[PDB]
Design a protein around this nucleic acid. Structure first.
Ligand SMILES: Nc1ncnc2c1ncn2[C@@H]1O[C@H](COP(=O)(O)OP(=O)(O)O)[C@@H](O)[C@H]1O
Ligand SMILES: Nc1ncnc2c1ncn2[C@@H]1O[C@H](COP(=O)(O)OP(=O)(O)O)[C@@H](O)[C@H]1O
Ligand code: BEF
Ligand code: BEF
Ligand SMILES: [Mg+2]
Ligand SMILES: [Mg+2]
Lengths: 458, 455
RNA sequence: GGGAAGGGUUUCGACCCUUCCCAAUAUGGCUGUUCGCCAUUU
RNA sequence: GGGAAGGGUUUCGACCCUUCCCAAUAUGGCUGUUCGCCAUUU
């Protein structure tokens, strides 16, 4: 049943070694079924489950035709959100370790335009982007989509909907028709699939898992009202006591209100919506990833594509407008063979929305009884996050950040979480008790023989 | 008088009085009204009669100090002439605050040009080589060009610069004003001149043989005896400023080496030296750090050296226009000058072509039966202080630093020239090393600067 | 560029504009006895 | 790019290229116990 990456017999041995080191020991169904047709040059439209590895699936076929000696853009990837753009760019950077000096650049809003322009002079090999800033660079004349080879659209059903299709049509004009086009998504409405064929030539359709074929996700539904949702959420949080929970809302107002309620209650919760600053969005995502926050209250911005390692619980505070969005947001848990729980709240006005979800997945809604009134148990964050002014621009790697952590300041390697290396900064998770001591001792410390400013993400 | 035509702003009229431009020269008074009216002009005038200011004054009335896009372009045959014209234009544009005038020419690194070119300058003085490179790489956008000036157009329009000038015009919009200035105009080039102009008005102030008060003497000598004759004549005239022109670069360097071997303090300017060396040599010779400057035809056009005493045609130029240009380096701005020319038996042809062009009988001189060879010591040396415009070095800064803080008074300090990356200052030879070694501290505008004796 | 402060669009994304504050060996302008003063930009 | 040493074109200009230093949160690539390796460009 298993299929190794060498069965494609077209990847270089360096790429096989890289995949073996990165932990890609066996191909997932999407990769095994789509890669040979992709790297043969076919325009492809691929559907797969949530968390089955479509990102690396198109990234391998993207990298296979990248001339590193050219130093010109020959691969473009389009994402619907900025955080997913960063994540896809990072996964592609890790995959592109068999090609030295492979410059991949991220173009999305929030970031400074001048820095992107100054970095865009040394033309990058691959560009992961959102249509907004990419359309700006194409109009001002900084991105050259001329020697372009592959154009990938991740979560393509969202990129071709009524909202993004106009910006996408504006973008594809700067791209040549003599290109390969890959359209990857987890859900494909037939009304969207019919229109999809306007950016591909004789596309190969690859539906791998059926519409109701989902990863191991147990679902529970609680019947409640609009006012009773917040106390019910607090009760369910104090009942299960999870470590990784994402609460999805339908508006930014509801999102921020639920976050404030869970915080005043005493349960560790951060907020991720489109009204905060992009710095706040990036740092909130980082903090929630490294366990500096128990709950992440987020709108549909964090519903597609995001890969939060070992997410335990998803809570539909309000059912999404479309059932595809429901599938995407419950797919945040049970990623890469894992399992998970997705509990959805249902007010009287949304009982119909839960029925299309029932008919689309062929599942019987496991309506659960709400818990009894109890005093709420607080959910504390296991650790905190330190932000160090450094990043890739300052040539800082996880090895030296960990070295400075267990070197002169004298801490323990077991009290250190994930070290994320961002372009301008580097974030490091440190257990709650040791966090403040580490921050105080690092302000007067030296990393790579240089004193660096550090801030405890309070 | 500059009170006429009622086009110049009141600030510029007061500015001209500050810079010493009291009266209008013939070329200026006859050309400016047609220039700042929008007409394309082709002007011929005396060497050293003010053509630079003539085209620069019209090249500043039609500039928008608010629009930070390019608006003018001047083309020169050499890099030093480009620097000179840029400095002249900056000195004129003191009435328009925050007026950026850039210099695009070879020898300079591409990086400073690329970085300073993102903030588009109002005027660009350039050589066709680097300007074309910037136009191809897409760093200069001539779409908003109002006026295009070509100084010494007969050299810019000959067969050597024909393809380059055409490729540069290719990037320029046709709807533009065009000014073509020169001292000499060969009729064959004047016929073709109309290809970059719209119904051009020809303004020939001075005739082709109407020269400034330059006295010319011709000496009969063999090829071997040229260098001894030069060493004897330099000792005999004992000049303060002398420029010796040669026909090849190796002849130039050899003549310079011989003049140094007889201890007559000569510097060299030719196309095989580093551009840093060329610029520093021109600076040193200008401020009086050398008595003799041996140069090829690179220094034959445009260069304005204040009160040049003597010109020496070691070899007669291949073309008569080049001869007129290289002898016009003396007797500028109403002064007089002397131009001695050696004529070997192999050069009698060109001496007649010259005599036909100027319509004068050649004064063939007889040297003394024998004269010794005296030395020629330079009156002062030059110090190069790092900084320039990066540190926003001002002449007042260098002057106030050299006085008191080191010891020497203002009488021992010569010409101060502020360049982009450095600043050069002339100091008497006696107080030269004392100044250098007391300047090693670094009391130069609160920032210690590396100073060096150019030697 | 880095901090603040707002609007516009807005189911959600992706976006579109406004004001101060400092940083800049980011660029330029200023009288020939210096250590400074103004204008654009990142 | 800051310093150098040259070659080619070579009537003269305007130009083209190479070798050694040096150093750049200039543009990126590289090992979860830090003070580094190398690919461009300036
Ligand atoms: N072949 C594989 N073996 C093991 N892990 C994989 C493999 N492919 C992908 N992964 C990991 O599983 C997760 C899949 O994330 P993702 O690619 O976004 O799934 P999808 O794109 O389908 O939503 C990532 O953490 C990825 O690194
Ligand atoms: N109206 C004027 N009055 C006095 N001096 C002038 C005037 N115009 C120009 N000059 C000076 O006389 C010299 C002429 O330089 P230049 O204009 O290049 O002569 P030309 O262009 O004819 O070869 C320069 O030093 C210039 O500053
Ligand atoms: F389908 Be996964 F969320 F990229
Ligand atoms: F035309 Be002049 F000699 F600069
Ligand atoms: Mg994905
Ligand atoms: Mg002139």
């Amino acid at each position: 049943g298993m299929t190794a990456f060498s069965t494609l017999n077209v990847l270089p041995p360096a790429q096989l070694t890289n995949l073996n080191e990165l932990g890609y020991l066996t191909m997932t169904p999407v990769q095994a079924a789509a890669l040979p047709a992709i790297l043969a040059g076919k325009d492809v439209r691929v559907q797969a489950k949530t968390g089955s590895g479509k990102t690396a699936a198109f990234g391998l076929g993207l990298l296979q035709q990248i001339d590193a000696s050219l130093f010109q853009t020959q691969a473009l990837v389009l994402c619907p959100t900025r955080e997913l753009a960063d994540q896809v760019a990072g996964e592609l950077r890790r995959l592109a370790r068999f090609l030295p000096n492979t410059k991949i650049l991220t173009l999305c809003g929030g970031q400074p335009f001048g820095m992107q322009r100054d970095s865009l002079q040394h033309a990058p090999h691959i560009i992961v982007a959102t249509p907004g800033r990419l359309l700006d660079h194409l109009q001002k004349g900084t991105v050259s989509l001329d020697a372009l080879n592959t154009l990938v659209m991740d979560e393509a059903d969202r990129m071709l909907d009524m909202g993004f299709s106009d910006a996408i049509d504006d973008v594809i004009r700067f791209a040549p028709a003599s290109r390969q086009t890959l359209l990857f998504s987890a859900t494909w409405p037939e009304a969207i699939a019919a229109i999809s064929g306007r950016v591909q030539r004789d596309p190969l359709a690859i539906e791998i898992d059926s519409t109701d074929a989902l990863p191991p996700i147990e679902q529970q539904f609680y019947e409640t009202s609009s006012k009773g949702k917040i106390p019910l959420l607090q009760r369910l949080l104090s009942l299960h006591q999870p470590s990784s929970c994402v609460v999805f809302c339908n508006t930014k107002k509801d999102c921020q209100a639920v976050c404030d309620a869970l915080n005043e209650v005493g349960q560790s919760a951060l907020s991720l919506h489109g009204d905060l600053e992009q710095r706040d969005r990036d740092q909130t995502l980082v903090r929630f990833a490294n366990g500096s926050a128990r709950v992440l209250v987020a709108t549909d911005v964090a519903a597609r594509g995001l890969d939060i390692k070992s997410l335990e619980l998803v809570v539909n505070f309000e059912l999404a407008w479309d059932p595809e969005v429901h599938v995407h947001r419950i797919g945040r848990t049970a990623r890469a063979g894992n399992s998970g729980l997705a509990i959805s709240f249902c007010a009287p006005e949304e009982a119909q929305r839960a029925n299309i979800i029932s008919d689309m997945l062929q599942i019987k809604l496991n309506w659960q009884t709400p818990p009894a009134n109890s005093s709420i148990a607080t959910l504390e964050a296991e650790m905190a996050t330190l932000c160090i002014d450094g990043g890739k621009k300052a040539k800082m790697r996880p090895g030296d950040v960990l070295g400075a952590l267990t070197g002169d300041i004298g801490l323990d390697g077991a009290d250190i979480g994930k070290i994320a290396v961002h372009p301008a900064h580097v974030y490091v998770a440190v257990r709650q008790a040791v966090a403040h001591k580490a921050w105080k001792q690092l302000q007067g410390g030296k990393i790579k023989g240089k004193t660096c400013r550090v801030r405890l993400l309070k």
